[PDB]
């Protein structure tokens, strides 16, 4: 070489693709044949980057055909890596803390616009779900009421619902949720009845101009979904207020994070009102009757830190099977605690 070649895959990716294009290309490594400590990977231009973590030290591996090169990341470099990873669920083996581009204070009722934005898009660390709890009959007992209250106050809620990176208009969900029979007073243990071709059209047409060429595709798509029972199950399940409580492990952590939150809130703002939850960020993708659906429901509960009003993002992911029915019973069984994966992440303001 003498010491080999001078070419570095990193420099290429850097001048060849955007910064986000790069990050968005990373996915959590679940494969059986993954490097030791590999928690995420990516493939772009015949290169395969691997983000491994060992001894609490993250190193980047670039595999180009056969040559192998790696870089160990400093503490700061790593914290940055996490600060710029896709909003997915990685096995980081520790709940990290991302800092937002804004100086917090202890005289506000809600997290700063920057904190929320940061939260909504940062990745989360998985909490091993092995001692998962068993299905109880009180599971999803409040599902209907929850989605109602959430969507109801969506006008002042950081709540957003997406289907394959396609934002589903809250208005639409507002009428859907209603035409389905969900309102102030509905039976907790009730079973939702699907909608006729007219009902969905009444809905879809009340939000989409028939003389429109623009959102013509979004129109047809939602027309289909709204009729699939499984979909309605996914959309609704995603709001159940206890979706993240799935095992003692999770409980232990969740318990701790809440203590820390409460403590700081007691010492730094005893007379300051703080909203409890910022809302929901649900993302439903059609898995590659009908079809099954993958869900990702994230809650943005306020979380007080040494800097100011922060947010503790708790994300849960599960898989709604093609044959599923919209009912407290159907959901507590099709979506048992063991089929769910919970992950945490804390987003804080700055000094």
């Amino acid at each position: 070489g003498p010491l080999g070649s001078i070419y570095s895959p990193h420099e290429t990716l850097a001048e060849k693709h955007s910064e986000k294009k790069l990050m968005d290309s990373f996915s959590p490594s679940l494969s059986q044949d993954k490097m030791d400590g590999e928690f995420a990977h990516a493939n772009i231009d015949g290169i395969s980057i691997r983000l491994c973590l060992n001894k609490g030290i993250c190193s980047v591996f670039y595999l180009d055909g056969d040559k192998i090169q790696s870089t160990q990341l400093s503490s700061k470099e790593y914290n940055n890596l996490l600060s710029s990873l896709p909003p997915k669920q990685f096995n980081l083996g520790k709940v990290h803390t991302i800092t937002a581009p804004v100086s917090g204070n202890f005289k506000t009722h809600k997290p700063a616009p920057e904190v929320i934005e940061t939260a909504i898009n940062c990745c989360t660390s998985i909490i091993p779900n092995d001692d998962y709890f068993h299905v109880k009959d009180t599971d999803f007992n409040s599902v209907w009421h929850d989605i109602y209250r959430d969507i109801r106050a969506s006008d002042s809620n950081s709540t957003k619902i997406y289907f394959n990176n396609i934002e589903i208009p809250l208005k639409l969900i507002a009428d859907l949720i209603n035409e389905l029979g969900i309102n102030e007073f509905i039976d907790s243990k009730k079973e939702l009845q699907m909608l006729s071709y007219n009902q969905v059209n009444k809905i879809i047409n009340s939000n989409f101009p028939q003389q429109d060429l623009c959102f013509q595709t979004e129109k047809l798509l939602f027309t289909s979904l709204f009729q699939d029972p499984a979909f309605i199950s996914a959309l609704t399940s995603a709001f159940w207020q206890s979706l993240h409580i799935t095992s003692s492990s999770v409980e232990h952590i969740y318990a701790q994070i809440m203590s820390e939150n409460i403590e700081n809130r007691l010492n730094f703002m005893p007379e300051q009102r703080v909203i409890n939850n910022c809302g929901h960020i649900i993302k439903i993708n059609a898995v590659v009757g009908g079809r099954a659906y993958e869900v990702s429901s994230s809650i943005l509960p306020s979380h007080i830190t040494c800097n100011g009003v922060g947010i503790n993002k708790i994300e849960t992911s599960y898989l709604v099977h093609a044959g599923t029915l919209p009912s407290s019973e159907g959901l507590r069984n099709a979506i048992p605690p063991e089929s769910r994966q919970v992950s945490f992440a804390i987003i804080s303001p700055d000094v």
């Binding site: 109880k136 009180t138 599971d139 007992n141 409040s142 009421h145 929850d146 209250r149 959430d150 109801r152 106050a153 006008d155 002042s156 809620n157 007073f185 907790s188 159940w240 207020q241 206890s242 409580i245 409980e251 969740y254 318990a255 809440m258 939150n261 409460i262 809130r265 005893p270 007379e271 009102r273 703080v274 909203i275 409890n276 939850n277 809302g279 809650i299 509960p301």
Partner: protein, 171 residues
């Protein structure tokens, strides 16, 4: 500490009964339909005057779902009083007052003052839990009982002013 007393109260009950709207009407004296569900714990602080005294009330809020019970428990102990809330338009919420009571025992101190409260009583149309049936069960335990409407501020202040006196009548 300019206050004379510092009481730690706690609200319990199934999800949607109105625990929060109750606390908000009591602290800020307002009622809205925007603050969504409560995940985890929360708390509000309001100071009143009883018998020319100054009592700093620290009320705690919680999630009604069963799954939250475990972690909620940590907040039971150390509480001077507990207010079990139920939805007078929902039968279920009352049938469970049994459990929310059994829970108070397994965690809080026996010398804790309890007060049952039937909220949403302004919805007379949908009402399904009779004042008498509840007033019954309430007295059979020696627990003071009241019907409240956080929406109209009906007996909301009295519910807390009662708990404040009940406790002050001890220490």
């Amino acid at each position: 500490p300019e206050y004379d007393a510092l009481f730690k109260l706690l609200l319990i009950g199934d999800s949607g009964v109105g625990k929060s709207c109750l606390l908000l009407r009591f602290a800020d004296d307002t009622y809205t339909e925007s603050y969504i569900s409560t995940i985890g714990v929360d708390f509000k602080i309001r100071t009143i005057e009883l018998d020319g005294k100054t009592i700093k009330l620290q009320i705690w809020d919680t999630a009604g779902q069963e799954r939250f019970r475990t972690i909620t428990s940590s907040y039971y102990r150390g509480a001077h009083g507990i207010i079990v809330v139920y939805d007078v338009t929902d039968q279920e919420s009352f049938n469970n007052v049994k459990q929310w009571l059994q829970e108070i025992d397994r965690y809080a101190s026996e010398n804790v003052n309890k007060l049952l409260v039937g909220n949403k009583c302004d919805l007379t149309t949908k009402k399904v839990v009779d004042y008498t049936t509840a007033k019954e069960f309430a007295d059979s335990l020696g627990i003071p009982f009241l019907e409240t409407s956080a929406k109209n501020a009906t007996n909301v202040e009295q519910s807390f002013m009662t708990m404040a006196a009940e406790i002050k009548k001890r220490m």
